Point group: C4
Chain length 388, copies 4
């Protein structure tokens, strides 16, 4: 095997087709399904799999009480077969911790998990299923990373980390790994003022990451990385189609180089594909909560501070719960272009459904089509009443 | 690996032997077995597996209530090892949707799943476990396909789809796929007046499909496809041994080029092997409901409008529930001829057993023998009372 | 791979060591373990596995009621990893039916399952996981076979079948298979008067089978097969150490060429290793029921009508339930000799423990040592009270 | 594959990072997790796995009552994927018995299990998943071995066994195996007065084992083995940082050549890495019970009778239960040095938590880092009240 190179451009996105769906909460009402959150999808050269952070309990288990909490000693990054649920019996643990990323470089997979108390966390970087490198907290305040896949080019796999405040300036670093070893790291540069939970994809030897400005911005920060020079830039999506949550209503003109205000100290992980007129943004439908999910075609969103939608697709109705969302692609597929894909975490339980004592999720995932396909909506599908 | 070619004729069918049986409803009374319907069997060069459409819940799970319904966002095509049950832990998802087909071409497998609302459905064609092509609804009325395996010849895998009314003329198309890409499609031609749910097999570079005329016919339509020319014909089975369900009693003379009347707007998926004097038809025993199942040797059924049985074999007694049935063969077996096989879906629960709130099935499957073997009957075997 | 040849003699048996044990009934009190009976062990070149006839239900499932019965449409030959229990999720179905044998020839595995009603049963012979040959009942009275592994030599795998009465003369046939095809069959010859359930092993190009004379004999019939000439002989074990069950007390002098009387129309599957002074016989301890199990070293048991034990080993105390027992060896092990092995079926439930409504078993298995090892006893270990 | 040689030295240990954690008791509150004890970790060239002695029941099963007991016919050495729990469906049985060790030699794995009554136990040595050698009890008093991995060098895998009293002199033997065959054995020599449960690692063609002196010592005996000469030495860790449990308080000066007194007839399995200034000792925090766990950097502990800690890391708080601990390394990792690893058994249930009737454990495991990483504590995490 050779290292994968990002040689292709994105396919033209004219609609989105169903790729995967695990129905995990429905199925786990009466089977041994682990409680999860922060899911994602990532491909190897011969298989694509679902990933998430386990909570170290089943959803029917008594230890599901308290799983609203984000960080414990009982979390782990797990992966499992595409569209199956994350079960006790089919989930493979990648590493232990409560914040993660993972990617395949064409030869083997790198997985990173962060664990520890808030003031003393550490990342362990695994390569070929073995621990290789460790990184201690630099700011002593919840070292944390993408919660979706990284992207590699000729063996170099950049990863975005943040350590520091969620409600003011923090210390974001871009690490450049190869075979699980640190080649270089850089502090964040550019005009993004706060970065968390980057969702990345690669095309034509460039990696684009759409992130969460938790502190101030309802527009999303974007980091663009050259994995050969090992350098990057940052800005915000210019468009007035605002894509964080909660957020204010959409204005007429956005902000390219600073956070669009109205909502402070909160957000959600999300994504975009930024490719000129072939630009699609994901967002929750609700401006107030993680409710609904839609894709909007917003030509030149990155650069055009007045850009509005020209097409769209509903993914989850606004009468259903959504959650985090992120990007991935099958960099080992056949053909001339990389097909954009994404997932949406469908959060069930706390805090919005507080008649149960747990929080979990299922996954839905879609990829682009060059056809203009009909749309369905894809809810989680479980009935909370059954769990009482 | 090279593409498989249909070089062999059918073996002489002198009786049927047990091939597989999963006992899924019995076992799922106390284990984590998914609710299914629309099962089938399909072989790869190194393994044969059971396939079906999951309902995204276990049979003991509370989400089994409502599973009489055919189309939801919680269905998927799954496969699992021959004669095991479809469990949460052993079922591999092929694709997401509520109508399917799948076949191996000798190199890898193509799987197709249709999803969407009734007026906006779409097919996704997967090849080598990746999405390759998408097809939007052409008639905006439940785009739908075979619900059993397709057949390939030198890489060309024809598939029959219908979109449109179930109770009047519809728009049937034969697509010719290779490596998941569309080579060609044609509209239905010939004298079949309505087509659904084709059950296909191949021999000597020809593919024969026995289908369901839901609208008018109690005889079954037959499509015969040349996968080299990429052309086809259609007619009905001429015999007065009528094989849809519900149906009128058997007459003395059938119809070759139009639907045999008496029953409108209903049917069941079924199959035949049409090979001159080596012709065998499957049918339910009951003329009123999906009850019992038998094979009848009906020499020249396709062409002889007075042909009656010369031999038979009971598969399921008329005091047991049956369901869909379909054809498959192991095109990678040893020997000089292809051995005909079939399966029967053994439907349990609603609507016939309405003391439970679910609908599911098990599978029995048989293949031909050149011996004249003794016969048993093969019921599902579960007791509904245990589920109350 | 080449076909395995029986080139080695037996290792010297000076005691027996623990090989495998599945604890299936203990574990299945609270996990999804299939109800079984008629287990055995058989090796492939790279793995050894447990085999048995499933009853198509879990032991906690409501469908376990009635599993005392031997023949239903819900039985199948399953295999699973050595010392694991037969679970819904790890059991591989080999074929469907209610009497079986299986063996590897060095290239691939042959498995045979018989199904049908008592007057119309048929065997299907699978090779390389595909059906190849079928055999109809010849006497219309419960066609039946070994219930433990067959043995192959240069691709020729003999199998012993019986069809006919269990309580008078029957029609026993030795079939010689190669690649699942019938080379030849012969009727039983020699002085054995009734044959069932042969337990076989091979050494130095000869196959020895120790069987059950259900009709009259409390000594066991022995068939010795030359798999090159495809011929056989039969007699009884001469020794007065009687090894069927139920049986009369041991006499002073046995019978070499006729059944030792005292018990009619019953028996149990059992085994021996018949190798001159290196001869070991298995038996239940009780003369009345399937209770206890012991190995006895009985020099020249086959030929010496006064031979008595010179050494022994208790396997199951007479205060614990036993069951069928049979022979197998790992013909692909390293070294200069074949190590004798056996298993004992530990039957729990009906008819001896009738406070439960099921019948099932676990497995213990041992192989020979050239050391004189200390002995333990190996009960099933489950508590029936837990199942009430 | 070639046999692995111990060519590397230990990496510099500046802290410990999380490697694996199975959360088995939390998860097994509502899934089919086997009851275990005496766990460990061991690597093959392509995978690392968790190992333990099953009790042949699930933790929710009724047969979990009585699992405080150490030796039964229902125990087996099982292995399962790293950080998954030991489930009925994913656990591979290595061999049957109630004391074990296992190691890979670079070509394949040797596993040893001891079974029998206390006065008549025997070891079976498996190689390449087949039984090869057997060893009878030499002292007729609970033949027993390491309960963690062995270590091999050029195919020679030494193993430490003890037979005899737990409360006076016993008969310890070092066996040197190759391909499961005995090359040599030696009686214990040196100044260790009692040996049990050795925890071993290899570096630079030497194997170091840290053991348990059950009879008298609260310092730990150390055996150092030359696997080429097949010879060994023994002494005690000289340091006054005492590492058995229970134990007296730490003195100022330890004992190098005799047991440090204060506690008789008890102990716990533990470990150390003894490498000059790169020396780290594990111990329980409590001096009275298996409570808490810490690593202490104790330069020259082996040789310096006044050596005190210079650094440490808490692994399990003293308000959480611990248990056995042992060493392992991935001898097939990339890089220039072997990274020290260890596990801690987190015992739950009896005797310390006697509101339940079972005893089981989970696993946490860590490996060394050359960074100075922040520390977390890693409890089992289950709530006993949930099991009542
Ligand atoms: C079967 O399946 C089919 C496939 O899925 C399905 O078809 C699909 O239907 C859906 C639903 O209708 C379509 O999705 C929608 O797409 C809209 C875009 O398309 C419309 O607009 C474009 C653009 O039009 C402007 O520009 C062009 C040129 O650039 C001009 O030609 C126009 O005249 C117009 O110009 C004006 O506007 C510009 C600025 O925007 C100015 O520059 C200009 O000067 C003028 O002012 C048209 O080109 C489209 O026409 C074409 O397509 C239609 C078919 O859809 C044909 O009939 C037609 O002939 C053409 O071919 C079309 O008119 C999206 O706008 C829309 O998304 C908004 O609405 C949804 C709710 O429905 C919101 O959830 C979403 O967030 C978007 O609205 C919010 O955000 C905007 C942006 O800020 C706000 O303005 C708005 O108020 C709203 O904000 C509020 O909500 C937010 C969210 O909660 C909140 O955050 C805010 O704060 C605020 O509260 C939606 O995506 C989809 O594209 C169809 N797909 C296809 C392929 O057809 C079909 O229906 C199915 N069949 C059945 C039977 O079910
Ligand atoms: C152990 O296992 C064994 C192996 O399984 C098992 O043996 C098997 O037994 C079963 C059961 O008996 C057999 O299965 C049946 O087979 C019948 C066919 O065989 C009979 O008929 C043929 C043909 O005979 C005609 O033709 C030949 C030449 O072509 C002539 O020689 C004849 O004289 C006769 O000619 C007349 O008819 C023609 C028109 O049909 C005219 O052309 C002609 O001019 C004359 O009028 C014979 O050859 C057979 O004989 C041979 O075999 C028997 C053994 O079976 C030997 O004894 C004998 O010596 C020969 O060797 C034989 O006589 C099928 O017809 C039958 O299926 C019908 O019945 C079942 C119910 O039992 C129905 O469910 C089924 O649907 C069929 O009936 C329906 O449909 C027909 C067609 O339209 C209707 O006419 C009929 O009324 C009925 O309709 C009703 O029900 C329908 C369904 O609900 C409904 O839809 C309708 O609307 C309506 O309500 C059945 O399959 C099997 O073949 C045996 N197998 C073998 C290998 O032997 C054995 O028993 C087991 N042992 C034990 C102990 O259990
Ligand atoms: C730790 O683990 C150790 C390893 O497991 C363990 O040691 C093992 O102990 C067990 C239990 O003791 C041993 O197993 C028993 O072995 C007996 C055989 O060994 C004895 O006999 C031989 C043979 O002796 C004759 O022959 C030699 C020469 O051939 C002569 O030298 C003798 O003098 C004698 O000659 C007479 O008999 C001949 C006819 O039989 C005539 O030819 C002759 O002219 C004379 O009349 C001896 O060689 C043995 O000695 C050697 O070994 C002992 C150690 O055991 C040493 O002390 C000694 O120094 C020697 O080295 C030894 O004496 C088996 O007979 C025995 O099995 C019977 O009993 C059990 C019950 O215990 C029954 O269940 C079983 O079925 C057998 O009895 C039934 O069947 C016989 C046969 O028909 C009947 O005769 C009998 O009445 C009985 O029938 C009844 O029950 C049946 C079953 O229910 C029923 O069907 C009938 O109808 C009827 O009701 C048993 O297997 C084992 O071998 C030891 N292993 C080793 C390696 O030592 C050790 O104890 C453990 N430690 C601890 C602390 O626990
Ligand atoms: C984020 O994560 C960080 C990384 O984990 C974390 O930092 C870590 O913090 C922990 C906790 O503080 C550290 O772990 C402790 O480490 C101690 C060792 O370090 C101290 O000591 C050394 C050595 O000092 C002597 O020697 C040097 C030279 O050799 C001299 O320079 C010194 O002056 C001194 O000399 C005296 O002593 C010698 C004899 O011992 C004589 O030779 C000499 O003549 C003098 O008398 C120092 O070098 C260290 O300083 C350096 O590090 C600190 C940071 O820790 C810096 O601030 C500093 O500037 C330096 O760089 C440091 O002072 C361990 O001793 C300690 O373990 C004991 O305590 C714990 C309880 O806390 C016990 O559980 C444990 O068992 C040990 O105590 C028991 O055992 C000893 C030995 O017998 C007994 O003496 C003692 O009484 C006690 O016994 C009792 O309990 C036993 C257990 O129950 C029982 O069995 C007994 O019977 C009895 O009842 C502990 O491991 C860790 O190393 C830090 N890691 C790092 C990298 O910094 C950080 O806090 C986290 N952040 C936050 C915000 O949470
Ligand atoms: C497991 C068990 O209880 N076995 C006992 C059996 C059975 O109770 C009956 O044989 C059942 O009918 O009875 C014995 O007398 C016997 O046969 O030797 C004693 C033996 O201990
Ligand atoms: Ca369960
Ligand atoms: Ca924000
Ligand atoms: Ca019809
Ligand atoms: Ca008998
Ligand atoms: Ca001690």
């Amino acid at each position: 095997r050779d290292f994968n190179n990002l040689t292709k451009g994105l396919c033209t996105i004219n609609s989105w087709h169903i790729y995967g769906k695990d129905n995990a909460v429905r199925i786990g009402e009466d089977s041994d399904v682990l409680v999860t959150r922060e899911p994602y999808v990532s491909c190897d050269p011969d298989e694509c799999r679902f990933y998430a952070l386990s909570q170290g309990t089943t959803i029917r288990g008594k230890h599901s009480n308290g799983t609203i909490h984000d960080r414990s000693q009982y979390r782990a990054l797990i992966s499992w077969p595409l569209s199956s649920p994350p079960t006790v019996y089919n989930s493979r643990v990648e590493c232990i911790g409560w914040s993660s990323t993972s990617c395949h470089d064409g030869k083997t997979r790198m997985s990173i998990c962060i664990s520890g108390p808030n003031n003393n966390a550490s990342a362990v970087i695994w390569y070929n299923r073995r621990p290789v490198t460790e990184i201690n907290t630099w700011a002593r305040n919840i070292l944390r990373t993408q919660e979706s896949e990284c992207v590699c080019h000729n063996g170099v796999c950049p990863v975005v980390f943040t350590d520091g405040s969620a409600t003011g300036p923090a210390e974001t670093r871009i690490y450049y790994f190869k075979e699980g070893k640190i080649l270089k790291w850089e502090p964040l540069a550019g005009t993004a003022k706060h970065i968390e939970e980057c969702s990345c994809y690669g095309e034509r030897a460039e990696i684009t990451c759409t992130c969460r400005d938790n502190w101030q911005g309802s527009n999303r920060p974007v980091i663009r990385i050259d994995p050969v020079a090992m350098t990057h830039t940052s800005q915000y999506i210019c468009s007035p189609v605002l894509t964080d949550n909660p957020r204010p209503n959409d204005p007429t003109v956005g902000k390219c180089n600073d956070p669009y205000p109205g909502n402070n100290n909160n957000g959600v992980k999300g994504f975009s594909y930024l490719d000129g007129v072939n630009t699609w943004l994901g967002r929750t439908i609700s401006i107030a909560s993680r409710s609904g999910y839609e894709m909007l075609k917003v030509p030149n969103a990155l650069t055009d501070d007045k850009s509005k939608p020209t097409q769209g697709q509903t993914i989850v109705l606004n009468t259903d719960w959504s959650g985090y969302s992120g990007s991935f692609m099958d960099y080992w597929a056949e053909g001339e272009c990389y097909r954009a894909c994404f997932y949406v975490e469908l959060i069930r339980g706390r805090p919005k459904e507080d008649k149960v004592w747990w929080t979990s999720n299922s996954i839905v995932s879609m990829c682009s089509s060059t056809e203009f396909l009909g749309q369905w909506d894809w809810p989680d599908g479980a009935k909370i009443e059954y769990f009482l």
